[PDB]
Ligand binder design. Sequence first.
Ligand SMILES: *[C@@H]1O[C@H](CO[C@H]2O[C@@H](C)[C@@H](O)[C@@H](O)[C@@H]2O)[C@@H](O[C@@H]2O[C@H](CO)[C@@H](O)[C@H](O)[C@H]2NC(C)=O)[C@H](O)[C@H]1NC(C)=O
Length: 403
Amino acid sequence: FNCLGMSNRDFLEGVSGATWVDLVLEGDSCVTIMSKDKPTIDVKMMNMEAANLAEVRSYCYLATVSDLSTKAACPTMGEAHNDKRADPAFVCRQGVVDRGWGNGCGLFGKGSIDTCAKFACSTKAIGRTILKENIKYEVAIFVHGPTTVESHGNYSTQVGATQAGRFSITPAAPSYTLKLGEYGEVTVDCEPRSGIDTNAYYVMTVGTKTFLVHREWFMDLNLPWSSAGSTVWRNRETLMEFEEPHATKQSVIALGSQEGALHQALAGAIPVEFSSNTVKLTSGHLKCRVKMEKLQLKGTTYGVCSKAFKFLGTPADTGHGTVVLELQYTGTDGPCKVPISSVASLNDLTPVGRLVTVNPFVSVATANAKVLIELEPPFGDSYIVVGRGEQQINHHWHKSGSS
Ligand SMILES: *[C@@H]1O[C@H](CO[C@H]2O[C@@H](C)[C@@H](O)[C@@H](O)[C@@H]2O)[C@@H](O[C@@H]2O[C@H](CO)[C@@H](O)[C@H](O)[C@H]2NC(C)=O)[C@H](O)[C@H]1NC(C)=O
């Protein structure tokens, strides 16, 4: 729910001298936003789901053929019409058979014949569309308030500390305002109608396994089908074989499962987990404007930490040109502001990078408080310095790269 630790991280600054920022979020990816006099926040794309899809087609894969009748008519007695023909559920084929003495007619010629049998669908396969209305994006936001190596990740700890927050965004409610305790609030205005069209490639469930299938291919499947809101099965003949016409009894059977031929014709297609009527999505992005007018800094009245700090390990490189490190304070002088910055040479009176953990704080009155800091040191050699004069400590950093 936090940027720290992700490869997929971006850095943004609010337009010099304005409050809001435009971004576009991407799957499993994170954005750290920095504004003069406001705390740093992280916006992150937790999850993007299409739920409650529309059922497009439906396709039968194993069928049953039942109650076979066949009406027969002697030569010159005209065309036989099996009465089962009035039945929506039955399926019928006219034919022609040699008849005569040897088999029931008083004349020799081609007698008529008409065969009906009932069609049932054992199991089926459903294709579904991803209309854009079905999309929900889930966004976490995190304020860079006092945090610890231990606690920076602990999602619960942050929520408790009025510091994290998970909300969703959908065309139904494209906007949200997350209140963040005394940090004020951040409002988000997004525009979900991004990436996916209303009618491309379908989602098709064959028994257990659900697939991302070529739309066009699904429509041409040579199987029986029922549309959206009805179980009437059209184009059934594809799964039933009508055998040789025996004068008395013609045989009508079902073809066995097609399940195998399908998992086969999809061996290569993109598999999707469709548990509980929703679909994880890996593509997709969201445009938002993130308004920070009402995001405030908190406790600027507090004094600067008067006592000595300590480094708790070599500062570590995040791999985005920023460093993370963890102080440990020694004093007990209430909560106070941490005197950390980055200077080009040790005696330097003004600083050189920027803090990412803007406005860092010892937030307790007990001894040995820890604070995590992430800062962006400048290119080349510099010292990270914490403290004033006698109690100053420091650590050197080189950052490679020119531009
Ligand atoms: C989120 O944090 C909580 C509790 O936070 C406490 O963790 C302590 C180890 C300590 O440093 C203290 O300062 C801090 O407030 C974790 O949940 C549980 O914490 C209790 C102690 O309060 C322990 O008995 C358990 O180890 C622990 N239970 C669990 C969930 O395993 C929790 O670990 C953490 N979130 C994560 C990353 O799981």
